[PDB]
Design an enzyme around this catalytic site. Structure first.
Site, mmCIF file in Angstrom:
data_model
loop_
_atom_site.group_PDB
_atom_site.id
_atom_site.type_symbol
_atom_site.label_atom_id
_atom_site.label_comp_id
_atom_site.label_asym_id
_atom_site.label_seq_id
_atom_site.Cartn_x
_atom_site.Cartn_y
_atom_site.Cartn_z
ATOM 1 N N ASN A 26 -10.249 -30.078 5.649
ATOM 2 C CA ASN A 26 -9.601 -30.303 6.937
ATOM 3 C C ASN A 26 -8.964 -29.053 7.526
ATOM 4 N N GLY B 176 -10.462 -21.462 6.342
ATOM 5 C CA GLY B 176 -10.027 -20.464 5.383
ATOM 6 C C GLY B 176 -10.641 -20.568 4.001
ATOM 7 N N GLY C 276 -10.712 -17.600 -21.079
ATOM 8 C CA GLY C 276 -11.367 -16.551 -20.324
ATOM 9 C C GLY C 276 -10.425 -15.455 -19.867
ATOM 10 N N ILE D 48 -8.875 -14.165 -12.622
ATOM 11 C CA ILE D 48 -8.234 -15.396 -12.153
ATOM 12 C C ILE D 48 -7.382 -16.014 -13.257
ATOM 13 N N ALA E 288 -10.914 -20.966 -16.868
ATOM 14 C CA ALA E 288 -11.191 -19.926 -15.886
ATOM 15 C C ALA E 288 -12.269 -19.009 -16.457
ATOM 16 N N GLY F 228 -15.308 -18.472 -14.972
ATOM 17 C CA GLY F 228 -16.159 -17.922 -13.940
ATOM 18 C C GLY F 228 -16.515 -18.952 -12.887
ATOM 19 N N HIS G 245 5.591 13.139 -1.531
ATOM 20 C CA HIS G 245 6.311 13.160 -2.795
ATOM 21 C C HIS G 245 7.739 12.698 -2.540
HETATM 22 C C1 FAD Z 1 -7.790 -18.509 -7.740
HETATM 23 C C2 FAD Z 1 -8.634 -17.528 -6.966
HETATM 24 C C3 FAD Z 1 -8.096 -16.293 -6.611
HETATM 25 C C4 FAD Z 1 -8.843 -15.361 -5.891
HETATM 26 N N1 FAD Z 1 -8.259 -14.122 -5.555
HETATM 27 C C5 FAD Z 1 -8.990 -13.266 -4.879
HETATM 28 C C6 FAD Z 1 -8.397 -11.995 -4.512
HETATM 29 O O1 FAD Z 1 -7.257 -11.635 -4.785
HETATM 30 N N2 FAD Z 1 -9.246 -11.156 -3.798
HETATM 31 C C7 FAD Z 1 -10.552 -11.441 -3.432
HETATM 32 O O2 FAD Z 1 -11.197 -10.591 -2.796
HETATM 33 N N3 FAD Z 1 -11.096 -12.646 -3.787
HETATM 34 C C8 FAD Z 1 -10.348 -13.504 -4.467
HETATM 35 N N4 FAD Z 1 -10.908 -14.716 -4.831
HETATM 36 C C9 FAD Z 1 -12.280 -15.002 -4.411
HETATM 37 C C10 FAD Z 1 -12.339 -15.512 -2.979
HETATM 38 O O3 FAD Z 1 -11.572 -16.709 -2.854
HETATM 39 C C11 FAD Z 1 -13.790 -15.775 -2.594
HETATM 40 O O4 FAD Z 1 -14.582 -14.621 -2.867
HETATM 41 C C12 FAD Z 1 -13.938 -16.101 -1.115
HETATM 42 O O5 FAD Z 1 -13.153 -17.251 -0.793
HETATM 43 C C13 FAD Z 1 -15.401 -16.290 -0.789
HETATM 44 O O6 FAD Z 1 -15.531 -16.627 0.602
HETATM 45 P P1 FAD Z 1 -16.763 -17.443 1.114
HETATM 46 O O7 FAD Z 1 -16.504 -17.568 2.618
HETATM 47 O O8 FAD Z 1 -17.999 -16.806 0.632
HETATM 48 O O9 FAD Z 1 -16.622 -18.873 0.431
HETATM 49 P P2 FAD Z 1 -15.554 -20.039 0.459
HETATM 50 O O10 FAD Z 1 -14.216 -19.517 0.871
HETATM 51 O O11 FAD Z 1 -15.568 -20.632 -0.961
HETATM 52 O O12 FAD Z 1 -16.338 -21.369 1.005
HETATM 53 C C14 FAD Z 1 -16.506 -21.660 2.404
HETATM 54 C C15 FAD Z 1 -16.189 -23.129 2.626
HETATM 55 O O13 FAD Z 1 -17.392 -23.921 2.780
HETATM 56 C C16 FAD Z 1 -17.132 -25.204 2.263
HETATM 57 N N5 FAD Z 1 -18.412 -25.870 1.999
HETATM 58 C C17 FAD Z 1 -19.237 -25.718 0.913
HETATM 59 N N6 FAD Z 1 -20.333 -26.440 0.969
HETATM 60 C C18 FAD Z 1 -20.223 -27.113 2.177
HETATM 61 C C19 FAD Z 1 -21.065 -28.033 2.838
HETATM 62 N N7 FAD Z 1 -22.237 -28.457 2.352
HETATM 63 N N8 FAD Z 1 -20.658 -28.508 4.037
HETATM 64 C C20 FAD Z 1 -19.493 -28.090 4.535
HETATM 65 N N9 FAD Z 1 -18.617 -27.234 4.003
HETATM 66 C C21 FAD Z 1 -19.044 -26.772 2.821
HETATM 67 C C22 FAD Z 1 -16.247 -24.961 1.046
HETATM 68 O O14 FAD Z 1 -15.511 -26.134 0.731
HETATM 69 C C23 FAD Z 1 -15.348 -23.813 1.543
HETATM 70 O O15 FAD Z 1 -14.143 -24.263 2.151
HETATM 71 C C24 FAD Z 1 -10.162 -15.680 -5.534
HETATM 72 C C25 FAD Z 1 -10.709 -16.909 -5.891
HETATM 73 C C26 FAD Z 1 -9.956 -17.839 -6.602
HETATM 74 C C27 FAD Z 1 -10.577 -19.161 -6.979
HETATM 75 C C1 FAD Z 2 19.271 13.080 -0.617
HETATM 76 C C2 FAD Z 2 17.952 13.768 -0.382
HETATM 77 C C3 FAD Z 2 16.769 13.030 -0.453
HETATM 78 C C4 FAD Z 2 15.534 13.637 -0.234
HETATM 79 N N1 FAD Z 2 14.367 12.858 -0.302
HETATM 80 C C5 FAD Z 2 13.217 13.459 -0.103
HETATM 81 C C6 FAD Z 2 12.002 12.664 -0.184
HETATM 82 O O1 FAD Z 2 11.948 11.459 -0.431
HETATM 83 N N2 FAD Z 2 10.839 13.392 0.042
HETATM 84 C C7 FAD Z 2 10.764 14.754 0.316
HETATM 85 O O2 FAD Z 2 9.654 15.281 0.488
HETATM 86 N N3 FAD Z 2 11.915 15.482 0.405
HETATM 87 C C8 FAD Z 2 13.073 14.863 0.186
HETATM 88 N N4 FAD Z 2 14.227 15.599 0.272
HETATM 89 C C9 FAD Z 2 14.111 17.026 0.524
HETATM 90 C C10 FAD Z 2 13.673 17.784 -0.718
HETATM 91 O O3 FAD Z 2 14.624 17.599 -1.764
HETATM 92 C C11 FAD Z 2 13.518 19.261 -0.376
HETATM 93 O O4 FAD Z 2 12.595 19.355 0.704
HETATM 94 C C12 FAD Z 2 13.019 20.107 -1.547
HETATM 95 O O5 FAD Z 2 13.941 20.014 -2.636
HETATM 96 C C13 FAD Z 2 12.817 21.549 -1.140
HETATM 97 O O6 FAD Z 2 12.332 22.290 -2.272
HETATM 98 P P1 FAD Z 2 12.622 23.830 -2.407
HETATM 99 O O7 FAD Z 2 12.004 24.200 -3.753
HETATM 100 O O8 FAD Z 2 12.180 24.522 -1.209
HETATM 101 O O9 FAD Z 2 14.243 23.927 -2.515
HETATM 102 P P2 FAD Z 2 15.298 23.342 -3.538
HETATM 103 O O10 FAD Z 2 14.800 22.090 -4.165
HETATM 104 O O11 FAD Z 2 16.598 23.216 -2.746
HETATM 105 O O12 FAD Z 2 15.379 24.416 -4.713
HETATM 106 C C14 FAD Z 2 16.094 25.660 -4.542
HETATM 107 C C15 FAD Z 2 16.857 25.873 -5.817
HETATM 108 O O13 FAD Z 2 17.315 27.244 -5.914
HETATM 109 C C16 FAD Z 2 18.704 27.256 -6.169
HETATM 110 N N5 FAD Z 2 19.238 28.483 -5.587
HETATM 111 C C17 FAD Z 2 19.552 28.733 -4.280
HETATM 112 N N6 FAD Z 2 19.957 29.962 -4.054
HETATM 113 C C18 FAD Z 2 19.900 30.561 -5.304
HETATM 114 C C19 FAD Z 2 20.184 31.869 -5.746
HETATM 115 N N7 FAD Z 2 20.619 32.845 -4.943
HETATM 116 N N8 FAD Z 2 20.003 32.142 -7.060
HETATM 117 C C20 FAD Z 2 19.561 31.173 -7.867
HETATM 118 N N9 FAD Z 2 19.249 29.907 -7.560
HETATM 119 C C21 FAD Z 2 19.430 29.669 -6.253
HETATM 120 C C22 FAD Z 2 19.238 25.948 -5.584
HETATM 121 O O14 FAD Z 2 20.465 25.563 -6.196
HETATM 122 C C23 FAD Z 2 18.097 24.988 -5.945
HETATM 123 O O15 FAD Z 2 18.162 24.464 -7.269
HETATM 124 C C24 FAD Z 2 15.489 15.014 0.032
HETATM 125 C C25 FAD Z 2 16.664 15.761 0.086
HETATM 126 C C26 FAD Z 2 17.899 15.145 -0.113
HETATM 127 C C27 FAD Z 2 19.161 15.968 -0.049
#
Ligand code: FAD
Ligand code: FAD
Lengths: 48, 470, 472
Positions: free
Chosen positions: B38, B41, B181, B185, B269, B271, B444
């Site tokens: 009914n 999907g 199995g 799944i 499960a 297949g 990073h």
């Molecule tokens: C528990 C589980 C988890 C899954 N998880 C994933 C996942 O994470 N990722 C993934 O890629 N795949 C997953 N799959 C597989 C995925 O569900 C199937 O590959 C997908 O649904 C296939 O799509 P389909 O359209 O070919 O068939 P379906 O979705 O099976 O079927 C189409 C429909 O036609 C209907 N039908 C059949 N015969 C007739 C008929 N004669 N008249 C009218 N209607 C009819 C059926 O009842 C069904 O509703 C999972 C499957 C299961 C069972």
């Molecule tokens: C809270 C916070 C969160 C962040 N999150 C991210 C993130 O998620 N992603 C991202 O890409 N960037 C992030 N950054 C930025 C990232 O940390 C910097 O871009 C990166 O550390 C720069 O690297 P660097 O080697 O150029 O300098 P630094 O890592 O600052 O290294 C320089 C080093 O040399 C030392 N130093 C300085 N002068 C001297 C000296 N004269 N003699 C000796 N040692 C010295 C310093 O003390 C330090 O240890 C974040 C920064 C902060 C503050």
């Protein structure tokens, strides 16, 4: 005409679809892109 | 008897089917969907991918909450109400199924509810709520999916012998539950029920769970789940008997317990098989093979030129994203576009704890096909992001052609590892080599930067690890 | 004193400096690191990226655990031990700082502890735990980083006036915390202390937080944080006075209270300034600009050809991954490779709740450059994964060149939004056509398949959304 050869294996999905639409052997298309990549311009140039 | 004429009828409304129908409509084709349940999907939305991800998200939080205790943030033991959890799972699904029904209406795709079977090369008969509808079609798209395998010695009728749909109904949390199995799944459902209180047993006939995935990747995952579950590798169920105190499973194999074990529930499960034999497709001339797959070419076309087939029913891998893309191509071809379904790669993700995810060639497949390859690995024990999120056992792996240095596959094991597959998949599709990947600046600190750092290992430029290629 | 000669001396041991040193060592160059702090890793590891993302992960679990109660999984109120959190944060850091020291040992890179200054074109002197060490060098890499901006009228010596280093020390959970600055660092620190129980005010002089990010992305972010924070936009601090009962802050602007407001702590996070003036770089002939930056060319050289500079100290963006990659190139050039630093993209992530993440061109930059572009967005309200993970307000945005259809920019706002940047950044570096992304098969259901789906919006092929590009 079209074949699933090594040029087709390496090509991008755009170029594979283009080549299969137009019956092109990609081994005969010279790629002008980076590292010999076959571009869409290469394929369009080749059809004529 | 209602009678209908359409340009395209789509048989089945899962991810493959409704994507096909909606693509058809957008391309201007008159389209009808036949679906026996009914809601739209199919398996993925109603009893598959979506409900299981929802329960695995609850499971993941519960586990993250407890891991915090050692850090100085102490949550009290969670009070569980499986009825509210269920009611929330059901809310998630209904929001999505309503949205599907709404897009079908907006695109003017008619939905006919009932069971469909071919009666001619251009005739489909539906038996449903409104009696029989006869559908005359220019084109048909078979998308009828698959179904869980059952074993015959199993009393599957007993309400304690579950398939995946039973497990996702969440009717109770069994004290002791067996998973038959080591497929994705089964492991996902074991992950869910463990978080809720169940003792989980898993019986797997091969030497590793998730057999398609590489050994080094699965070694990490196995080490983790070997503490949460009792895992029986190289073990087979040899008989099952239902008693009044629980289900008794006798096993033969390495880890097989001597005596019949007692369980409160058994999830089978092992297949899924395609539904291709259940459509009278042969009455339309459509060839169905010995295993019930409807085979198609790369335009998703059957041996009958105006009948296509998509999704689970045409073959492995049985995954939603494969079906969706096949549905687009089938609609495009019918609309007259010279399009083909030929992806380089199709990703697979197990949403377990940790996740296991891979795309492109595995080492197994590369060895079989004779490819000369080289792997590069980044361990999450060196990732500040992974340490600061308590997932330091993870690992990111890339696989490269030895000679050309192009990437041909990759894999991640770790918390949130699935989300890294997007980059690796694109890298393979775009023909990237290790240098292209290593030179792209990755943010990073992140988990996905491990993909660039793995490429740096291969390139011999890595500085966040010892560099044996210096 | 002690005298040493080396091929390369690296001044500073943050992501830029230690990556440069280790790369030098891997290329066969004799290398010495000078670091004033006790550990390697600089700001990022010790008082920066790593401790902040550790505390942020704690904050995210706290808020996800509370959110589960509405779905039938009720955790009691979390009992928190601040000093145990301190201990855990330090255990995370020490694991990495020990790793860096171990790798320095294995690459035979000597570390001289102390504060280094140049005394000539080829000589640097250090004062540290071993006394004075003079280091003769063939090449130097200045990697000395940046430092928080301070204001002259702020009494920074009060323990209640914090910079980001103070904030990561977890001195106390103040009842009311003012964050000065709506940039990334201050928002992240507000997110941590809010989850520990602080009331959070944020004062920002501009009309949006995260000013570089696009308006549509930030609109989604601002709607969420406005529930948690008192956000005061287009508002400026004019006075800060320390009294016994707290810190009194006078503000001017659209939402400034008439009365100076009392805070238990004020976090000053208005930006960072390069350390380029504090090195006696002039004594080696190195030119330092008026902002304190040591500007470099595309091979990381200063005006003195054998002296390089990398990381925060050479310019914006002050990000760790920029410094790491500049470090590698500088080392490779010293070793004789014809390498250049000129990335197409440098990603930026705010690890807030939700996260804000972008790479390549923003719409703001594209308009500056006069580029004809088209955006394509996928709303997470349409994502089963986002719904089922309770984060349905997210959005994924791609920006395409209107003529060539190559991807030139992307952005995400959403839970775990930052991890999607890897695919988008590579797509821009590889010059992907929208069709290249669209036809790539992204696993379902995931957050990152929104990248593919956004490409399908642009292509006009999407089916998981209404398709306004469909036929009539
Ligand atoms: C528990 C589980 C988890 C899954 N998880 C994933 C996942 O994470 N990722 C993934 O890629 N795949 C997953 N799959 C597989 C995925 O569900 C199937 O590959 C997908 O649904 C296939 O799509 P389909 O359209 O070919 O068939 P379906 O979705 O099976 O079927 C189409 C429909 O036609 C209907 N039908 C059949 N015969 C007739 C008929 N004669 N008249 C009218 N209607 C009819 C059926 O009842 C069904 O509703 C999972 C499957 C299961 C069972
Ligand atoms: C809270 C916070 C969160 C962040 N999150 C991210 C993130 O998620 N992603 C991202 O890409 N960037 C992030 N950054 C930025 C990232 O940390 C910097 O871009 C990166 O550390 C720069 O690297 P660097 O080697 O150029 O300098 P630094 O890592 O600052 O290294 C320089 C080093 O040399 C030392 N130093 C300085 N002068 C001297 C000296 N004269 N003699 C000796 N040692 C010295 C310093 O003390 C330090 O240890 C974040 C920064 C902060 C503050």
């Amino acid at each position: 005409e079209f074949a699933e050869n090594d040029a087709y294996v390496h090509a991008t999905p755009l170029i594979r679809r283009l080549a299969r639409e137009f019956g092109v052997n990609l081994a005969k298309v010279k790629g002008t892109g980076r590292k010999g990549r076959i571009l869409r311009e290469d394929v369009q140039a080749y059809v004529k | 008897s209602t009678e209908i004429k359409t340009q395209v009828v789509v048989l089945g409304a899962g991810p493959a089917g409704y994507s096909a129908a909606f693509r058809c409509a957008d391309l201007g084709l008159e389209t009808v969907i036949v679906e026996r349940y009914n809601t739209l999907g199919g398996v993925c939305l109603n009893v598959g991918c979506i409900p299981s991800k929802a329960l695995l998200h609850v499971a993941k939080v519960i586990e993250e909450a407890k891991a915090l205790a050692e850090h100085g943030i102490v949550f009290g033991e969670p009070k569980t109400d499986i009825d509210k959890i269920r009611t929330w799972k059901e809310k998630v699904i209904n929001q999505l199924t309503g949205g599907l029904a709404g897009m079908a209406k907006g695109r003017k795709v008619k939905v006919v509810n009932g069971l469909g079977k071919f009666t001619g090369a251009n005739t489909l008969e539906v038996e449903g709520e409104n009696g029989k509808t006869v559908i005359n079609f220019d084109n048909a798209i078979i998308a009828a999916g698959s179904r869980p395998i059952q074993l015959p010695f199993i009393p599957h009728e007993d309400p304690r012998i579950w398939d995946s749909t039973d497990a996702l109904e969440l009717k109770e949390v069994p004290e002791r539950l067996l998973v038959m199995g080591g497929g994705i799944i089964g492991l996902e459902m074991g992950t869910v029920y463990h978080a809720l209180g169940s003792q989980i047993d898993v019986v797997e006939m091969f030497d590793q769970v998730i057999p398609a995935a590489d050994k080094d990747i699965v070694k990490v995952f196995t080490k983790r789940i070997s503490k949460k579950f009792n895992l029986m590798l190289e073990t087979k169920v040899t008989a099952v008997e239902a008693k009044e105190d629980g289900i008794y499973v006798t096993m033969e194999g390495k880890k097989a317990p001597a005596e019949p074990q007692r369980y409160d529930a058994v999830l089978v499960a092992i297949g899924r098989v395609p539904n291709g034999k259940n459509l009278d497709a042969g009455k339309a001339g459509v060839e169905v093979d010995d295993r019930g797959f409807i085979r198609v070419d790369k335009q998703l076309r059957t041996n009958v030129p105006h009948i296509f087939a998509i999704g689970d029913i045409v073959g492995q891998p049985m995954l939603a994203h494969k079906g969706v893309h096949e549905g687009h191509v089938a609609a495009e071809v019918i609309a007259g576009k010279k399009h083909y379904f030929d992806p380089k790669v199709i990703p697979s993700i197990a949403y377990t704890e940790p996740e296991v995810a891979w795309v492109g060639l595995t080492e197994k497949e590369a060895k079989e096909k004779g490819i000369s390859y080289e792997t590069a690995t980044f361990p999450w024990a060196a990732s500040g992001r992974a340490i600061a999120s308590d997932c330091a056992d993870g690992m990111t792996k890339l696989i490269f052609d030895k000679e050309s240095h192009r990437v041909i596959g990759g894999a991640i094991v770790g918390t949130n590892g699935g989300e890294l597959l997007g980059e690796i998949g694109l890298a393979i599709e775009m023909g990237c080599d290790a240098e292209d990947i290593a030179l792209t600046i990755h943010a990073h600190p992140t988990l996905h930067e491990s993909v660039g750092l793995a490429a740096e290992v291969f390139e011999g430029s890595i500085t966040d690890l010892p560099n044996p290629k210096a």
